[PDB]
Amino acid sequence: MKKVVAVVKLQLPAGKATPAPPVGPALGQHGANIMEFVKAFNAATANMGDAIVPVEITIYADRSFTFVTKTPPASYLIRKAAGLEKGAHKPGREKVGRITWEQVLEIAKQKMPDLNTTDLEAAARMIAGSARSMGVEVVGAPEVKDA
């Protein structure tokens, strides 16, 4: 029993969005809450930093809005996957921004249902790759070219 009626997919300024986004009028369709939208948004884009994120506000008929993206594509979810969470303090000395093959795959597999790709390598690479550009590094994914 799950069916979305309106899914706003757009890119908003991370750490710079105001209660007057480009959609605004086209967004207030889940209960009329533009502040809560940006309020929480800024909270995240405020704890992480400034950037652009392809919001995917899934508005369900039951006036239900669900979505959680942080930082441009790939990083939208890879970030949290890389280990970005802090919580309220950090242990000390730690290279933040690391993902593992099994993770980029679990992320790609759910990102390549039937679009146009096929082999995981193509998708996986696109994933672990996007992370690579995100300064992130693939903690796993051993280059075993000899065994």
Tell me, what CATH number does 79's domain have? 1.10.10.250
At a CB cut-off of 8 Å and minimum separation 6, what does 70 contact? 14, 44, 45, 48, 53, 76, 77, 79, 80, 84
Indicate whether 77 and 147 sit together in one domain. yes
Indicate whether 49 and 114 sit together in one domain. no
Backbone φ and ψ for 91, nearest 5 degrees, come out as -60, -45
Structural domain span for residue 114: 71-147
Q: Measure the CA dihedral 38/106/130/17, to 10°.
A: 0
Number of domains in the chain: 2
Quote the CA–CA distance of 49 and 141 in Å, as a whole number.
Answer: 28
Indicate whether 120 and 79 sit together in one domain. yes
Indicate whether 5 and 25 sit together in one domain. yes
Indicate whether 87 and 131 sit together in one domain. yes
Assigned token pair, 37: 């939208």
Indicate whether 63 and 80 sit together in one domain. no
Experimental technique used to determine this entry: NMR
